[PDB]
Amino acid sequence: LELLSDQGYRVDGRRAGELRKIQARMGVFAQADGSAYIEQGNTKALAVVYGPHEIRGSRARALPDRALVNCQYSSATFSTGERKRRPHGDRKSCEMGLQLRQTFEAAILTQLHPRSQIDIYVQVLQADGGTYAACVNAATLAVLDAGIPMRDFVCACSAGFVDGTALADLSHVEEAAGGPQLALALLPASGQIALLEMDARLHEDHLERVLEAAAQAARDVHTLLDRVVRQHVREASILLG
RNA sequence: UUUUUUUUUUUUUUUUUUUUUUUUUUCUCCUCUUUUUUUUUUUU
């Protein structure tokens, strides 16, 4: 099957260094302390956060120096072509909630809420392509909506490598083809990387170009989400006064 | 030849948990030429 034509067009019609269309939203729910909604291409995510509160259970599991970040991951049973129902014991959810907890224990400026918990929930309504970056961006928007201070605006994007060229924002068809996939979590102002992942084989000479293309695609996600945040804050500033 | 007074480092600790590798596709596809097919035999 052709994943890159001779003309340079992909299966869905975009070039190598081209992203899908994103359409976000802030303030979806009312009861919670924060909310967000993003649809990156054909993947629909959702995130809900709860502000610093009293530790549930009160089983002396607190930290006297910082706060306790608690991230979960879930997925709807109609999120793909087949039903594929799973119980709440899978290790895919555990590893996704652990990479989420790892990146948000580094992005959030947590040394201001001693002996407090932060509960972050992510719900995926339709998965087609990169799920990690869609969850990270939806929870970055939900955290901004909740007013929790943070060092920067963390954004994530993936990449690939086919026929000696570097792709960007891979889809499920391209992902399920046995290629060197790769994902980041970038802080645009400093250029630092919060998380790095990889699978499948790849030569050592092509790591610089796949990593550079992924970082550039994350910097391209940054501008599009930045205009959404600026329009939202100008909206509320106009409403307030 | 210049008296008298203006307190200070948050209180708390004797919390239960009965799971388990993975996980999810890619179609049908013209094999060229001396033949029947030789064959016992012996030295390993």
How many Å does it take to go from CA A191 to C1' B17?
A: 42
Query: Other C-beta atoms within 10 Å of A73: how many?
Result: 23
Write down the H helix ranges in A74-121. 91-107
Residue A182 to residue A62: CA distance in whole angstroms: 35
Torsion of CA A47, A154, A22, A218, to 10 degrees: -150
- List the Cα angle A222/A207/A154 in 5-degree steps: 20
A178 touches strand B (CB under 7 A): no
A74 touches strand B (CB under 7 A): no
How many Å does it take to go from CA A230 to C1' B25?
A: 43
How many Å does it take to go from CA A5 to C1' B27?
A: 20
Residue partners of A30: CB distance under 8 A and separation at least 6: none
- Smallest CA-to-CA distance from A81 within A128, A123, A132, A42 is with A128
- Smallest CA-to-CA distance from A100 within A125, A82, A74 is with A74
Residue A231 burial class via C-beta count within 10 angstroms: exposed 0-12, middle 13-18, buried 19 and up: exposed
A1 touches strand B (CB under 7 A): yes
Residue A150 to residue A130: CA distance in whole angstroms: 24
Count of all residues that appear for chain A in the document: 241
Measured to protein CB atoms, the chain B nucleotides within 7 Å are: 13, 15-16, 19-26
Residue A176 to residue A130: CA distance in whole angstroms: 11
Solved with:
cryo-EM
